[PDB]
Amino acid sequence: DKIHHHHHHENLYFQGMEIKAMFRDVSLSSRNFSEMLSRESKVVAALAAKSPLMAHANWRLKGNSLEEATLYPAFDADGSPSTPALAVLNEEQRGKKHSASHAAIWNGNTRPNEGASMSCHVSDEKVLPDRFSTRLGVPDCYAKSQDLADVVTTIVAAFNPLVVEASPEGYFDKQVFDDKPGVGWMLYLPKVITQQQVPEARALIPVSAKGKQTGTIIVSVTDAPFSVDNPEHVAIANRIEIRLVDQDLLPAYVDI
């Protein structure tokens, strides 16, 4: 109900798909809202191609209430960051030296399972990694793995991350290593990962950029939408996690 439009509800448990990325951009500040919203606009564009409910015009800033969460559109008609949105983010940042959510937006849809939201977490000290996350909702029978791969590749091109995790909420309690990233439905790593290294993987999608393979998306399930309630989906994602660690391909969260 308030999972997408309220600011702090991103810390609460919900039923839906979650794509979490960790990156290190030494040129990105926590006050550079224009660059944050422009990167989010690229991710929104990938979602808008799949569903009309994700169109840029519908997206709004998050708020402390449903009323102020529907007042400010995130983008202009062309998809660029809107000035009213940048004006609000600059005023809320004023004085506040510490914030756990930057450029937090939602698709303005309050209907169950029809909503979506995303936010950035930029650290100015750059000792801890920067973060980006997006929440979409429970995948139905018409949820193709290629559609999720397209959204992950767009996030890789927009943030050049060190890791992207894609899994339904609640998979973290089911992953083999709690100190290392989970495979879930998909896992992106900025390394060339082959069939010989991970023979359990149902798909290994190469991600290319600047004239070479930048990384690989590891897919556990390709026949149906990944379900945390399906013990077969969890067991194969768990086997892939064990395989990746056995060959020192899976880093610890603290080491990222």
Two tokens, residue 179: 């100190």
Sorted by sequence, the CB contacts under 8 Å of residue 129 that are 6+ apart come out as 22, 23, 24, 123, 162, 256
Q: What separation, in Å, do the N-terminal and C-terminal C-alpha atoms of the chain show?
A: 34
The answer to whether residues 238 and 187 touch, using CB atoms and an 8 Å cutoff, is no
**Rounded-to-integer distance, Cα 174 and Cα 215, Å:** 25
Full DSSP string of 62-116? -BSSTTTTSSSBSB-TTSSBPHHHHHHHHHHHSS----S-EEEEE-S--STTT--
**Rounded-to-integer distance, Cα 216 and Cα 213, Å:** 8
Tell me the sheet residues that pair with 19.
Answer: 134, 166
The answer to whether residues 145 and 222 touch, using CB atoms and an 8 Å cutoff, is yes
**Rounded-to-integer distance, Cα 204 and Cα 192, Å:** 10
**Rounded-to-integer distance, Cα 190 and Cα 179, Å:** 19
Nearest to 111 by CA among 226, 225, 4: 4
* Cited resolution, angstroms: 2.2
The helix/strand count (H/E) of the chain reads as 4, 9
User: For the packed helices 145-159 and 33-48, what is the interaxial angle rounded to 10 degrees?
Assistant: 160
Label residue 94 exposed, middle or buried (CB < 10 Å: 0-12, 13-18, 19+).
exposed
CA distances from 121 to 22, 51, 70, 130, 193 (A): 9, 26, 22, 6, 28
Question: H or E segment at 147?
Answer: helix 145-159
Two tokens, residue 176: 């083999």
Using left for φ > 0, alpha for ψ between -120 and 50, and beta otherwise, residue 97 falls in alpha
**Rounded-to-integer distance, Cα 230 and Cα 63, Å:** 35
Cα torsion 152, 80, 138, 1: sign? positive
User: For the packed helices 33-48 and 83-93, what is the interaxial angle rounded to 10 degrees?
Assistant: 130
CA distances from 133 to 11, 92, 201 (A): 12, 21, 24
| One-letter identity of residue 210 | K
